[PDB]
Amino acid sequence: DQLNSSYFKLSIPTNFSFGVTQEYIQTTIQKVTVDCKQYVCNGFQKCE
Amino acid sequence: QLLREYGQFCSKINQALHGANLRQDDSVRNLFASVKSSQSSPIIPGFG
Lengths: 48, 48
Hints:
The structure is cut from a larger assembly and holds two copies of chain A.
Chain A: H1 36-41
């Protein structure tokens, strides 16, 4: 509660604890190279 | 009957929308938890 008087109420902890916050930040994505000719034709001459 | 032959398709569209809606709910919870203050003073008429 705020105080009308010059004195002001203060809320202060008498106890403390340690806690760990875990954060993951992605920095990279999988690098994929595709052989377009092999995927489209499946190594068949007529398709080539 | 014509839609049934397509098999998977409508299911994929529904699953993607369901995932997006869950992500939005997670975002709202995280922002509001940060917004909340551990200690606050009760609002009174003529505040400020």
